[PDB]
């Protein structure tokens, strides 16, 4: 299949948050079969971020997830042509976020167009107060609407001093191309920055996802 059991990543996210305009890149490399990666990621426009870089973490390929052979993969068929996918993420103080991303192939090099808007964080908050320490690890639910896939995964941020902070996600998946559409399932996620400089300008970023019933 096109789909190499070692594959490049490369990235550009633009958008903005709270009015605060910026651009991201990065490249990574991961095992699309095992469902783990690894992102070098550097704020090439508008740092420091102002903001927690949590939201922006889930943004930056569900190709990278391991699925067991009883359950097709729509995101494996879906290459060489590529898919996109749109989400909303609605968080618990009405802070929103929507994102979008279109991802392409060329020779064992995934390439994503990212777009990522959010707006209405309290000033107080810990998205803007940069209280946020990783993502509680979930389980999201995938199943097909519509002639297309969907996935909805209650998120949530552990803060400072113990708290959590919760977040609705809503993610619409939309192949180029027709495939086997599967049956509902779950998919188990673990996203982590494994490093990253003072005011996050190069983060490392590493995520383990697989899929099952």
């Not at 704020?43 to 922006?56: H, K, M, N, Q």
């Not at 639910?141 to 552990?158: F, N, Q, S």
């Amino acid at each position: 299949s096109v789909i190499k059991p070692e594959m490049k990543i490369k990235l550009r996210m633009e958008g903005a948050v709270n009015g605060h305009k910026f651009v991201i890149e990065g490249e990574g490399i991961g095992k699309p079969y095992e469902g783990t990666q690894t992102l070098d990621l550097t704020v090439e426009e508008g740092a420091p971020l102002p903001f927690s870089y949590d939201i922006l973490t889930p943004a930056f390929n569900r190709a990278f997830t391991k699925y067991p052979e009883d359950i097709p993969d729509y995101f494996k068929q879906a290459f060489p042509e590529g898919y996109s996918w749109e989400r909303s993420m609605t968080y618990e103080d009405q802070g929103i976020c929507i994102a979008t991303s279109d991802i392409t192939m060329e020779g064992d090099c995934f390439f994503y167009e990212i777009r990522f808007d959010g707006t209405n964080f309290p000033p107080n908050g810990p998205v803007m107060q940069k209280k946020t320490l990783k993502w509680k690890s979930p389980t999201g639910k995938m199943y097909v609407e519509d002639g297309v896939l969907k996935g909805d995964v209650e998120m949530a941020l552990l803060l400072e001093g113990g708290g959590h902070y919760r977040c609705d996600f809503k993610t619409t998946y939309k192949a180029k191309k027709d495939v086997r559409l599967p049956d509902a399932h779950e998919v188990d996620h673990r996203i982590e920055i494994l490093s990253h400089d003072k005011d996050y300008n190069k983060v490392r970023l590493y995520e383990h996802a697989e899929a099952r019933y």
